[PDB]
Amino acid sequence: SFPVQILPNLYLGSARDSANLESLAKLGIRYILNVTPNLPNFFEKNGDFHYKQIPISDHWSQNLSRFFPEAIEFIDEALSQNCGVLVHCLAGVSRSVTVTVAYLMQKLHLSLNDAYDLVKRKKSNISPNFNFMGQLLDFERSLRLE
C-alpha cells in the first residue's frame, strides 16, 4: 500500500505504507511530517526535502499538543509552495488523521464532519478515537469563535 491523496499535494500515510523517499519524490513530495507518540521533536533539510517529527500524545488531555499549530504551519508552508506533503503516522494512523483533519478545518474552513469524511473517503480502515474527537471538537469551537 502507498500514501493516499486527501487533497492536491496533501498525503496521508499509515504505519504499513511504503514511505519510500523515492516513491515520495516521484509523487512530487518535498515535505514529510512524522507524527508519532513520544519521539523527540526534530527537523532537518535534505536540500530539496524538508523533514519534521512532532509528538502527539494520545493521552486523555483535551489539550491539543501545542504541536497542532506547528504541524499546520509545516503542512501549510508546504502546500503554499505548491508541493507535496506527507503526514505520516509511524505507529498507527489516528494521530496523523487527527492532524490532517485539524488542518482541513482551519485552512479549508471545513467542519469536523466534512473534514473527517474527506479523510474517510480516502482511508476507509480508519476509525474515530474519542479522545482525539474530543480534542478536535474543542479545536473547532475556537475556530467557531471567529
Active-site option among 89, 99, 101, 126? 89
- Say what the resolution is, in angstroms: 2.7
Q: CA 74, 58, 80 angle in degrees (round to 5)?
A: 15
Method underlying the structure = X-ray
- 99-128 as b/e, with b when 16 or more CB fall inside 10 Å? bbbbbbbbeeebebeebbebbeebbeebee
What structural domains does the chain harbor? 1-146 (3.90.190.10)
Q: Is 89 a catalytic residue?
A: yes
- In sequence order, which residues have a C-beta less than 8 Å from that of residue 103 and are 6 or more positions away? 10, 71, 72, 75, 76, 87
